Coordinates of C-alpha atoms (C1' of nucleotides) and ligand atoms in Angstrom, one line a residue:
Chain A
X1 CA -79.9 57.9 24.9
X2 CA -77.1 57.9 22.5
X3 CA -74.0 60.2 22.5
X4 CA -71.9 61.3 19.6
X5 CA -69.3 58.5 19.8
X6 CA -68.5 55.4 22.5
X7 CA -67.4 56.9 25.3
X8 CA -65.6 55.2 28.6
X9 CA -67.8 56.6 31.3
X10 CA -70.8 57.6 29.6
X11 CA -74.3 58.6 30.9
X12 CA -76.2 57.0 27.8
X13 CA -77.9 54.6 30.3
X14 CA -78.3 57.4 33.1
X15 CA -79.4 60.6 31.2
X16 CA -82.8 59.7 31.7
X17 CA -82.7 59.8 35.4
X18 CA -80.7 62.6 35.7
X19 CA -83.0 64.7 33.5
X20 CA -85.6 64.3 35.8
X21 CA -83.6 66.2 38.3
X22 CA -82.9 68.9 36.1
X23 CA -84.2 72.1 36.9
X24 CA -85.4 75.0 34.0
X25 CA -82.7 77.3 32.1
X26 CA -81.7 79.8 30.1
X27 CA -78.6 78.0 28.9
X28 CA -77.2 74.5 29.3
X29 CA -73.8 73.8 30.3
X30 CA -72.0 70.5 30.1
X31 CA -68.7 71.3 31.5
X32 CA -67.1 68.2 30.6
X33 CA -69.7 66.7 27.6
X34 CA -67.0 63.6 26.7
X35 CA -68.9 61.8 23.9
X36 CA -72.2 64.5 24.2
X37 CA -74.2 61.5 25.8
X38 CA -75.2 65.0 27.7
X39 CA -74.9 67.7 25.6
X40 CA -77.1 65.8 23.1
X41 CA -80.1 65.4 24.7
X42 CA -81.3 68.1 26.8
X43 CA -83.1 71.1 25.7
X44 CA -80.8 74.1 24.3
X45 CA -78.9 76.5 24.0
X46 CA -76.2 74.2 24.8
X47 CA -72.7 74.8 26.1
X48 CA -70.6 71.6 25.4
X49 CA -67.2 71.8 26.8
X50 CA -64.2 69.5 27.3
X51 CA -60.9 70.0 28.0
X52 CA -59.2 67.8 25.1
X53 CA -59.6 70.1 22.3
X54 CA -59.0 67.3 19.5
X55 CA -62.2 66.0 20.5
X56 CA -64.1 69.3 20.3
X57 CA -62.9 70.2 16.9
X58 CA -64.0 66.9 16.1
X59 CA -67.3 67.6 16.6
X60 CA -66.9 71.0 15.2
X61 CA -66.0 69.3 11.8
X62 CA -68.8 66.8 12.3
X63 CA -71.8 70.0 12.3
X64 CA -70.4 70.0 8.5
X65 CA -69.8 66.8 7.1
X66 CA -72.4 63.8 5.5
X67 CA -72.1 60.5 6.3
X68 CA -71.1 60.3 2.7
X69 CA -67.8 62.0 3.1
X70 CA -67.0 59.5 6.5
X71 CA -67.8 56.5 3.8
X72 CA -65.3 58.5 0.9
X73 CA -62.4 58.7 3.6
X74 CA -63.1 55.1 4.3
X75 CA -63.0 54.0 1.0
X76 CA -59.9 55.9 0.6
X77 CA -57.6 54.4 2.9
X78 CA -59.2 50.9 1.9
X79 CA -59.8 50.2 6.3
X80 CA -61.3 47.2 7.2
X81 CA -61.4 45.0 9.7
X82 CA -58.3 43.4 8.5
X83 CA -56.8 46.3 7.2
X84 CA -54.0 47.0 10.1
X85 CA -51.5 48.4 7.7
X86 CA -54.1 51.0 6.2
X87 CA -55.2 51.8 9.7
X88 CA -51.4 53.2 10.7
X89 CA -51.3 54.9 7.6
X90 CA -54.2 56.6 8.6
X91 CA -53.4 57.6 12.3
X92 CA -49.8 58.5 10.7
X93 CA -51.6 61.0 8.4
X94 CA -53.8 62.5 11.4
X95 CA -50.9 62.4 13.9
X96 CA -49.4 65.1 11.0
X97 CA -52.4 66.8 9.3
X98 CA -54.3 67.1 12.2
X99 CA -57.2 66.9 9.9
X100 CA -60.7 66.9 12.5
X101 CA -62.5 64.9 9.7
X102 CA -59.6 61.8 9.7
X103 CA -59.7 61.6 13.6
X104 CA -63.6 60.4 13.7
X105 CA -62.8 58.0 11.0
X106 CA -59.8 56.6 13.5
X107 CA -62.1 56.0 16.3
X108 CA -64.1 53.6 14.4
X109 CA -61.4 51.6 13.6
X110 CA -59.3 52.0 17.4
X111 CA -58.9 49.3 20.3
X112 CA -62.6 49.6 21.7
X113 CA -63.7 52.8 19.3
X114 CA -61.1 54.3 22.4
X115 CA -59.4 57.9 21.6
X116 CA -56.5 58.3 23.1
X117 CA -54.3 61.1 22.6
X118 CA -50.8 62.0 24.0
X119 CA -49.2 65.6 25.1
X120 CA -48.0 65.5 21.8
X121 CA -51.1 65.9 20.3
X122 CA -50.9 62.7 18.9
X123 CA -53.2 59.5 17.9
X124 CA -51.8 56.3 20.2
X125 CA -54.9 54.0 20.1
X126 CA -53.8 50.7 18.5
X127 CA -56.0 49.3 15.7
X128 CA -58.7 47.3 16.9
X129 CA -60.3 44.8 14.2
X130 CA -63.1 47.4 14.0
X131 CA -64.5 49.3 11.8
X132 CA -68.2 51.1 10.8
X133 CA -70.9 48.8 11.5
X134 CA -74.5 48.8 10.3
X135 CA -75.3 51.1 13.0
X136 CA -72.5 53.6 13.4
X137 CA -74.7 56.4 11.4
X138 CA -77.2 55.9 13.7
X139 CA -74.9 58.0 16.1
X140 CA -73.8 60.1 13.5
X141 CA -77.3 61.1 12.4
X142 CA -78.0 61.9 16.3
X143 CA -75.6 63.9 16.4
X144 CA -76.9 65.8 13.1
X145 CA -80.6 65.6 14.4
X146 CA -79.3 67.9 18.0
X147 CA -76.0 69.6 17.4
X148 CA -77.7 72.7 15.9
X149 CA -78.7 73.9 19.4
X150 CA -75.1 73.0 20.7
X151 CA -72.4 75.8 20.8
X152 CA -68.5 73.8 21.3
X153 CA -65.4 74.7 23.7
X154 CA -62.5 73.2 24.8
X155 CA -61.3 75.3 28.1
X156 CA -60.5 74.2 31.0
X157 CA -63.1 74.2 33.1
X158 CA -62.3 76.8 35.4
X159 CA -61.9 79.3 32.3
X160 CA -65.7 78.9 31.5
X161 CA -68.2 81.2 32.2
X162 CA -71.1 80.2 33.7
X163 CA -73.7 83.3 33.6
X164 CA -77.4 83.6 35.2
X165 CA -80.3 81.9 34.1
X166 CA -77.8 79.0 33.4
X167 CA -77.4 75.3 34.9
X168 CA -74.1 73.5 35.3
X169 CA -73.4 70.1 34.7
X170 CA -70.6 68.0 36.0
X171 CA -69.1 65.0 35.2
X172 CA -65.7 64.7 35.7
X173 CA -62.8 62.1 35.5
X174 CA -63.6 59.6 38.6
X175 CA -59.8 59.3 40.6
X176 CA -61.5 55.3 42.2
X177 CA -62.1 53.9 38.5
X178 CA -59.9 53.5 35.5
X179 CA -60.1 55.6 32.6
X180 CA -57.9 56.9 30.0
X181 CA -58.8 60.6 31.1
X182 CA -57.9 60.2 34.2
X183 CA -54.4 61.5 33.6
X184 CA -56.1 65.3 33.4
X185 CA -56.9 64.6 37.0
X186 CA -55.6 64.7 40.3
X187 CA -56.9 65.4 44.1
X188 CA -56.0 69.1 43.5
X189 CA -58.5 69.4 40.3
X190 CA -61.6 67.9 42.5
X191 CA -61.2 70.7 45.1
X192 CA -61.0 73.2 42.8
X193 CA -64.2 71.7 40.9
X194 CA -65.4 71.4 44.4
X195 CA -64.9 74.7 45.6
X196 CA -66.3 76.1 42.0
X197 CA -69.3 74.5 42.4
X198 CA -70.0 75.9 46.0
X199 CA -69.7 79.5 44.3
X200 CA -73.0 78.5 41.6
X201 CA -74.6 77.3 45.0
X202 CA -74.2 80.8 46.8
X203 CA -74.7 82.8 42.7
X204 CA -78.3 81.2 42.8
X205 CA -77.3 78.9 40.1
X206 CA -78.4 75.4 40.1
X207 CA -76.0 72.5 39.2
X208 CA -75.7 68.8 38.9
X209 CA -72.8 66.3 39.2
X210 CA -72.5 63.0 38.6
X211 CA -69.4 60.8 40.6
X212 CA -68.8 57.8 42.9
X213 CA -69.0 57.4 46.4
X214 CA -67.5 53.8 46.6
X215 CA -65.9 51.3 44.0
X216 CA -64.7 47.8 44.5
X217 CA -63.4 48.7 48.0
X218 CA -62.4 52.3 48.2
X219 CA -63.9 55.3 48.7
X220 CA -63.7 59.4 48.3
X221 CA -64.4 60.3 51.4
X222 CA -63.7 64.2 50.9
X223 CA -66.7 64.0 48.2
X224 CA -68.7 61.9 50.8
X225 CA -68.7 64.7 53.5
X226 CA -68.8 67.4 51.0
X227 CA -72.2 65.5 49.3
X228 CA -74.1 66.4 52.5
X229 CA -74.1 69.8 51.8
X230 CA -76.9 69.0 49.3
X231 CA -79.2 66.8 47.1
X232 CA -78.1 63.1 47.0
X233 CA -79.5 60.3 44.5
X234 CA -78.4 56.7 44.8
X235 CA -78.6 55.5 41.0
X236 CA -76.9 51.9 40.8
X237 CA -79.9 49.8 41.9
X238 CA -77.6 47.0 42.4
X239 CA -75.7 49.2 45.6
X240 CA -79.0 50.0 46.6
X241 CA -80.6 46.9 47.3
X242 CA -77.1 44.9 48.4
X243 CA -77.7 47.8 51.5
X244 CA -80.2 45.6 52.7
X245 CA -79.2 42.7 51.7
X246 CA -75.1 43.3 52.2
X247 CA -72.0 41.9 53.1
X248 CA -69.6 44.8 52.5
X249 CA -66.9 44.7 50.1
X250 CA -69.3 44.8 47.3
X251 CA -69.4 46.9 44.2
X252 CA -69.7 50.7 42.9
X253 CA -72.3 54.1 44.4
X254 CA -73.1 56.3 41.7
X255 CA -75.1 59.1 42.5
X256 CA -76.2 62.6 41.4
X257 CA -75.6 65.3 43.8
X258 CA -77.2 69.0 43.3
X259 CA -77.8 71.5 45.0
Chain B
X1 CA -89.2 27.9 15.0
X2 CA -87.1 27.0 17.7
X3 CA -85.5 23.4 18.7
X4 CA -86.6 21.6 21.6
X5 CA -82.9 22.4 23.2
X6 CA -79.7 24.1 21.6
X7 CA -78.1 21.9 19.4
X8 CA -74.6 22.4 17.4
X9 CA -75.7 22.2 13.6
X10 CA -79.4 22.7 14.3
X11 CA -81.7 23.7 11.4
X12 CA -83.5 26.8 12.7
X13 CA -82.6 29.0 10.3
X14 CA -82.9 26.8 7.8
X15 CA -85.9 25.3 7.9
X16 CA -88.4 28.3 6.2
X17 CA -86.1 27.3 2.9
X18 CA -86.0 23.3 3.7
X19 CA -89.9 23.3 4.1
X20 CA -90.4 24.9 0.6
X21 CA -89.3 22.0 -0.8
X22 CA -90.9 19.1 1.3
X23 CA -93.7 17.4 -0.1
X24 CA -96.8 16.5 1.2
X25 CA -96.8 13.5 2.7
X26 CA -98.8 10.1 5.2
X27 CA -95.8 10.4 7.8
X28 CA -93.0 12.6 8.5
X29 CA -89.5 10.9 9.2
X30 CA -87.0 12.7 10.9
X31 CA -84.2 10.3 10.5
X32 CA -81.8 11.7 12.3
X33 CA -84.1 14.3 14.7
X34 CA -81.5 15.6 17.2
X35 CA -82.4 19.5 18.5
X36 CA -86.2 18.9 16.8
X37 CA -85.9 22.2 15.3
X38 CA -87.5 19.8 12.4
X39 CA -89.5 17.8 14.3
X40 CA -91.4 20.3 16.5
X41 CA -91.7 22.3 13.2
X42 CA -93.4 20.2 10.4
X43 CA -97.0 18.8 9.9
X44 CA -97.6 15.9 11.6
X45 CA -97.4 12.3 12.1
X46 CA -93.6 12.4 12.9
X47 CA -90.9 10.0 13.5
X48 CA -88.6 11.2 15.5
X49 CA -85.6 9.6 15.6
X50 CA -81.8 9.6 16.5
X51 CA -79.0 7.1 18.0
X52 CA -78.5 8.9 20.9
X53 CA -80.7 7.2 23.6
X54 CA -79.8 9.5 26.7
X55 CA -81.4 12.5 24.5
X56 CA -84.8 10.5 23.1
X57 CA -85.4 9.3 26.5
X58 CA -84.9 13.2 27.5
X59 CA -87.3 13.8 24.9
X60 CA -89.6 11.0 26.1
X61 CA -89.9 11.9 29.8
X62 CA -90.1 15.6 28.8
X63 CA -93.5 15.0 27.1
X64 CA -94.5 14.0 30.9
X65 CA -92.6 17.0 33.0
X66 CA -93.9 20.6 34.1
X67 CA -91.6 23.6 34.3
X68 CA -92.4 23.4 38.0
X69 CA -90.9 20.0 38.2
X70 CA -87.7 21.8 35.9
X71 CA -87.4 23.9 39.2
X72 CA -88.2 21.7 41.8
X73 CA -84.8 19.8 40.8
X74 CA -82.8 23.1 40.4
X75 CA -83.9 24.6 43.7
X76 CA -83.1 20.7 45.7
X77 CA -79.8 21.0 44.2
X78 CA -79.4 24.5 44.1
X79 CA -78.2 25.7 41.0
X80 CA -77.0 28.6 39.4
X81 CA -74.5 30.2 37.3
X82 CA -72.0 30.0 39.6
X83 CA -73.0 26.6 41.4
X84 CA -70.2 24.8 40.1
X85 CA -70.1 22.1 43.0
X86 CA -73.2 21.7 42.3
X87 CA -73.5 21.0 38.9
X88 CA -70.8 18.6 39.6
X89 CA -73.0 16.8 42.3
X90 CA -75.5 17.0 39.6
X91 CA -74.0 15.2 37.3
X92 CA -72.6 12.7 39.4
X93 CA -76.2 11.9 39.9
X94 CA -77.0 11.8 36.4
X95 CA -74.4 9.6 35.8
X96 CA -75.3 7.0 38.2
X97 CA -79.1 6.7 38.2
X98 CA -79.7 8.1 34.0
X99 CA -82.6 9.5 35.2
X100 CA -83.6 11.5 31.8
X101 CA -85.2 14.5 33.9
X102 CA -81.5 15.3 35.5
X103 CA -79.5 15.1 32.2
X104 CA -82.3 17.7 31.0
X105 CA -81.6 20.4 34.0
X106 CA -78.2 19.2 33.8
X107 CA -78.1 20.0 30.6
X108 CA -78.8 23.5 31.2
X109 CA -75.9 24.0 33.5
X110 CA -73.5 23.4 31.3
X111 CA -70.7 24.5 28.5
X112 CA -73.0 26.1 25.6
X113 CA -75.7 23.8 26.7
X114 CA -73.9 20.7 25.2
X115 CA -74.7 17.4 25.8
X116 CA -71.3 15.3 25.4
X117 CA -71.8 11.3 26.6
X118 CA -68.8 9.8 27.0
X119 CA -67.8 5.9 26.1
X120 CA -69.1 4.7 29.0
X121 CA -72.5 6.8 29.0
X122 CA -71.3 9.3 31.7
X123 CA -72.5 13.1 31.1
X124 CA -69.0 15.0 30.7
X125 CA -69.9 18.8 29.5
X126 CA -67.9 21.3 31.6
X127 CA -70.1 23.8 34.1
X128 CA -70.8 26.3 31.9
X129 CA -71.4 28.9 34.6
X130 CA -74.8 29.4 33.1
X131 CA -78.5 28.2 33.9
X132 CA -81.9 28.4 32.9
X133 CA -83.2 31.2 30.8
X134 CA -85.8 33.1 28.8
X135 CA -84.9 30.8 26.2
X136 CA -85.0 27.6 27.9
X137 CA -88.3 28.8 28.8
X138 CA -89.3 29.1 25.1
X139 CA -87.6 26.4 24.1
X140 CA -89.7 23.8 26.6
X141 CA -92.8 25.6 26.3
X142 CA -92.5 25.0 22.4
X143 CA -91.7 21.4 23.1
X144 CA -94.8 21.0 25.1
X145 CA -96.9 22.6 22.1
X146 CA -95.7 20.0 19.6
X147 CA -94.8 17.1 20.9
X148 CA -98.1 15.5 20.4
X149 CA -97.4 14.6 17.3
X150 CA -94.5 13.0 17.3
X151 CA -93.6 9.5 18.3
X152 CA -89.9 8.9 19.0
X153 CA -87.3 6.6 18.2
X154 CA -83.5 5.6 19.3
X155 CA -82.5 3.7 16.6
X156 CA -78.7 3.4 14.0
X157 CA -80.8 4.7 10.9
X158 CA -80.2 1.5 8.9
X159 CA -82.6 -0.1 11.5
X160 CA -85.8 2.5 11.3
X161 CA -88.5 1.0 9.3
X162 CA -89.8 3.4 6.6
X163 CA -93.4 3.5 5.1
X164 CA -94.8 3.8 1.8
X165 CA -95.8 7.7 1.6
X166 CA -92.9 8.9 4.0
X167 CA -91.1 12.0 3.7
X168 CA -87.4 10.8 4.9
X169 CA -85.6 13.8 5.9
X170 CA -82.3 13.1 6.8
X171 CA -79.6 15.8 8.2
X172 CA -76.7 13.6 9.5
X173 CA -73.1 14.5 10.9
X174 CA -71.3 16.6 8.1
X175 CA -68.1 14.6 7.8
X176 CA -66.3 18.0 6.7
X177 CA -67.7 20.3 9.8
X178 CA -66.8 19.2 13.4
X179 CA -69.0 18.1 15.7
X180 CA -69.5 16.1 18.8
X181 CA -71.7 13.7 17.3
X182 CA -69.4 13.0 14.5
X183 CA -67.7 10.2 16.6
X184 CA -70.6 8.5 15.2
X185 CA -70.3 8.5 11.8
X186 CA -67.3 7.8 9.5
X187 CA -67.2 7.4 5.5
X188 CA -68.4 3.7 5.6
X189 CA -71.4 5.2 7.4
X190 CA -72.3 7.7 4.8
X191 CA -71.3 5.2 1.8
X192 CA -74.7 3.3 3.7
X193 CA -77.1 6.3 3.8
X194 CA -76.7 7.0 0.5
X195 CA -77.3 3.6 -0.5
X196 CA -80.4 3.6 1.6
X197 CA -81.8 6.7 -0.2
X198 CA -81.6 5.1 -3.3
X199 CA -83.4 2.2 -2.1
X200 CA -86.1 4.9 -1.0
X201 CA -85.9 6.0 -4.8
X202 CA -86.3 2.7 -5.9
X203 CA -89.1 2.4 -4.0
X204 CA -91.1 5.5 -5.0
X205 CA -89.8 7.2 -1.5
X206 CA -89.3 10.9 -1.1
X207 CA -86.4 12.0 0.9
X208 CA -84.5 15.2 1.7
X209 CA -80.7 15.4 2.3
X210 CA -79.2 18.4 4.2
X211 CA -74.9 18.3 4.4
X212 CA -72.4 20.1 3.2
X213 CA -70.2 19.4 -0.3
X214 CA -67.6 21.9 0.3
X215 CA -66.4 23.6 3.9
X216 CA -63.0 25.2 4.7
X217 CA -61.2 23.7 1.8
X218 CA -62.4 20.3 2.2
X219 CA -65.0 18.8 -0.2
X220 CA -66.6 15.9 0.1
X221 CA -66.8 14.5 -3.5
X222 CA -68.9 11.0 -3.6
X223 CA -71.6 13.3 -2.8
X224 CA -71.1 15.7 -5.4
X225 CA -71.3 13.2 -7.8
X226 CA -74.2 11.1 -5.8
X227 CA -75.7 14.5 -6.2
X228 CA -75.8 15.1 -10.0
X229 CA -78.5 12.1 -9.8
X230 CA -81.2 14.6 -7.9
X231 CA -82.4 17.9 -7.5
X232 CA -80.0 20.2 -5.5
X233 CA -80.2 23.6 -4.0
X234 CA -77.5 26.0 -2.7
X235 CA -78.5 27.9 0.3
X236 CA -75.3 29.8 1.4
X237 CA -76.0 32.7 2.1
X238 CA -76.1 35.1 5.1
X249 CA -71.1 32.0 6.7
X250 CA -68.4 31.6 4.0
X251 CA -66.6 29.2 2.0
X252 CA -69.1 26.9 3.1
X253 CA -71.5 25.3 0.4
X254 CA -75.0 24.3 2.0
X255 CA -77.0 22.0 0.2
X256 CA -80.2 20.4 0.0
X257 CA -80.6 17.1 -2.1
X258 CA -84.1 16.0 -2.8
X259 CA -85.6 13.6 -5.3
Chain C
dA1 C1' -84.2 46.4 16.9
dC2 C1' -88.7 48.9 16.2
dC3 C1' -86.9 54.0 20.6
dA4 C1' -82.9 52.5 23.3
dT5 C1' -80.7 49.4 26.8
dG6 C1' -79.0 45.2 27.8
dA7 C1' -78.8 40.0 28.2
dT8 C1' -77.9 36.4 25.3
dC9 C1' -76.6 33.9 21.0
dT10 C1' -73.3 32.9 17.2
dG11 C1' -69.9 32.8 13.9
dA12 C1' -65.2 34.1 12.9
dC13 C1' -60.5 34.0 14.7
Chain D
dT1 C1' -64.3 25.4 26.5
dG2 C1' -61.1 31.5 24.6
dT3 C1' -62.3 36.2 22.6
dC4 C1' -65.6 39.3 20.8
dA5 C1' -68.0 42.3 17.3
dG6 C1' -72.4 42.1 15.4
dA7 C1' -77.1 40.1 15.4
dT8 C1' -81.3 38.7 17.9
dC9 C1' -84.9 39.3 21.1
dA10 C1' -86.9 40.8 25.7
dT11 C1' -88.4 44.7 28.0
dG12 C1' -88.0 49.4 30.2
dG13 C1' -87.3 55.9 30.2
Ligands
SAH301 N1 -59.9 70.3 33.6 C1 -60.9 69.8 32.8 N2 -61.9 70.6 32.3 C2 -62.9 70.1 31.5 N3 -63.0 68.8 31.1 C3 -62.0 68.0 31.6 C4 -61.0 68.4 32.5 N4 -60.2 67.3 32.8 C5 -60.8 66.3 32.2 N5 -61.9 66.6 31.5 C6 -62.8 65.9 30.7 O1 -63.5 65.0 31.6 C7 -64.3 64.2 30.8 C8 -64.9 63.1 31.8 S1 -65.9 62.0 30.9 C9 -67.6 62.8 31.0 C10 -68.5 62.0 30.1 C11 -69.7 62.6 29.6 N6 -70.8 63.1 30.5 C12 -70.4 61.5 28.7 O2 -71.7 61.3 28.9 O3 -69.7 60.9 27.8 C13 -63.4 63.8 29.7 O4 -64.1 64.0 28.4 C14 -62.2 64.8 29.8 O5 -61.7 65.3 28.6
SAH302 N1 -76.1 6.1 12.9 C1 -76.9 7.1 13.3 N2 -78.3 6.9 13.3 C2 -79.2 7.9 13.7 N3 -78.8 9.1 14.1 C3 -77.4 9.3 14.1 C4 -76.5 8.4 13.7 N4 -75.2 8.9 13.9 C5 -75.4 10.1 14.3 N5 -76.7 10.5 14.5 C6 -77.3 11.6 14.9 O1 -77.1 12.6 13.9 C7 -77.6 13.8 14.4 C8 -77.0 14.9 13.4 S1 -77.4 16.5 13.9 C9 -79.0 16.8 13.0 C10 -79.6 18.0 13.7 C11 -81.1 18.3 13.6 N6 -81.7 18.4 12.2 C12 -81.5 19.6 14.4 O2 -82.2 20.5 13.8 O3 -81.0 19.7 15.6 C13 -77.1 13.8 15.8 O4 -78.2 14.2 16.7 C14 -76.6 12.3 16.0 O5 -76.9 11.8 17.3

DNA sequence: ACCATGATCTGAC
DNA sequence: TGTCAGATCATGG
């Protein structure tokens, strides 16, 4: 199920699973949504929040915007896949305007459709011999076809308010596998998350998170122990079956644990 | 429509447009048949033929091998996309008893599929880290389907004898693109084909030429002007400043 | 490509 | 026999 832009870490592939395993609510909360893989398709009220703010008011701008003005802003700067001058003009203008509207034309154009964004508030992503393709409104017009029910955020995620009747999903940064993001987190953070999610369990509110066990070689053991204090789902079928059929030092465990 | 294997400058896509422009004809000659994407593709009788010998044998033997026998070899050698000692013991093989049915698993195994014989008829394509496929599947299975109507041929072109009521279609090496097969022809060789069509046309034959007049800067000029005697048709389309061309009479 | 994912193919660089 | 974004086709949320 597609999400409002690429995303590293996405659950595109895995929503459909973890729906399943969803209970029934009042309110939807997607503490970290990331690129809305999430957020977009469950059923609402939704609470879509991130921490990177730049993102959210992206999206914000997005609720109000046609296709039509993407292609104007486009045809404005003259980008193209060649157009690497035009390109820094454009991430120049943003990294000073700060207009919501430029930074989701960026994207498109970026190393990988990859946003990343520096304390300073400011667009580093290096341009990327991208640009729109014949199916980048196909995101755009999910996101216009779901983000009516959606209600934006970007706290923290200890400063959000999770009330009764709602259910909490989590998916933060993952500390065993690379990702741009990860530089909001830290050993500290997943306790904290950890502990949080504990005080849902004993509020009679149901959650879900999404992580990995084992990557590559290494492992989170904290998470491991702390998993068996509820639901576990194994979802790579490739970690799965090399169980039986292992040698060890094999590849990544993702699974879905709620209580 | 699909070849009979991958082939570098194959006409799959352009065949629909090519075929709207064939006539009707007693036999089909395909005079330089490589991939088959013609071939397999086009009413029937055909002459297939091609100066490779290590492919039209492949071809020949084909016409008498199962899938089943396809796996047989790949599980006695077992291969796979990461069997790279085993390709090369493969190979080896191939290289030293010919035997057609190895060069067509081998052929699998390697770099985009490519079939490169060397001067001394050794099989030298790099493991490709690949192997058999849903489209090597296809690709055999349509093989199988339409090879019944073809009979074969290994032959230089000047040597195939052509009928009275033969379509000669003719797609040789592009002397402007690069290809592996171009060690094969040269400007003397072309100068000959053309002189061999117009013996066709003096002989009340209908032929087809596919090529190329124009392709990254290069043009190849005899041709335009051996052109302006028939019927020509651009198909570039969508691929660039290449010029695509079909030369009929 | 179609609903969407993903494996594979192919034409620029 | 490199890289890879976009296209093609098989099939499974
Ligand atoms: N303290 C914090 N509070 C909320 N979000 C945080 C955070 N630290 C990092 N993040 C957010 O963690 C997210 C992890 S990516 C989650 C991906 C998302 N489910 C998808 O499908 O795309 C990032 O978007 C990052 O901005
Ligand atoms: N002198 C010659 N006589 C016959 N075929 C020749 C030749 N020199 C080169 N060739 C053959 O020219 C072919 C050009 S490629 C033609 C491709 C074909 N229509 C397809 O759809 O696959 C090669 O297969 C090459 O082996």
């Amino acid at each position: 199920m597609l999400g409002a832009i690429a995303y590293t870490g996405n659950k595109q592939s895995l929503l459909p699973e973890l729906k399943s395993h969803f209970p029934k609510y009042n309110r939807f909360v997607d503490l970290f949504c990331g690129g809305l893989s999430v957020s977009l398709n469950v059923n609402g009220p939704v609470l879509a929040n991130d921490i990177q703010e730049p993102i959210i008011e992206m999206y914000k701008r997005l609720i109000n915007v046609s296709w039509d003005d993407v292609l104007k802003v486009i045809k404005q700067y003259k980008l193209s896949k060649t157009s690497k001058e035009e390109f820094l003009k454009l991430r120049e203008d943003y990294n000073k305007t700060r207009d919501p509207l430029l930074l989701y034309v960026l994207h498109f154009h970026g190393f990988s459709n990859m946003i990343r964004i520096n304390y300073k508030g400011n667009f580093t992503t290096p341009f990327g011999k991208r640009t729109i393709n014949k199916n980048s409104e196909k995101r755009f017009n999910h996101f216009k076809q779901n983000c009516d029910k959606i209600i934006f955020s970007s706290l923290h995620f200890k400063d959000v308010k999770i009330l009764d009747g709602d259910f909490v999903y989590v998916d933060p940064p993952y500390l065993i596998t690379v990702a741009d993001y990860n530089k909001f987190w830290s050993e500290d953070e997943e306790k904290d998350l950890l502990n949080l999610l504990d005080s849902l369990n004993d509020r009679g509110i149901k959650f879900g998170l999404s992580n990995v066990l084992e990557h590559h070689g290494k492992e989170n053991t904290l998470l491991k122990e702390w998993s068996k204090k509820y639901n576990v789902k194994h979802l790579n079928k490739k970690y799965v079956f090399n169980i039986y059929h292992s040698k060890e030092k094999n590849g990544t465990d993702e699974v879905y644990i709620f209580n």
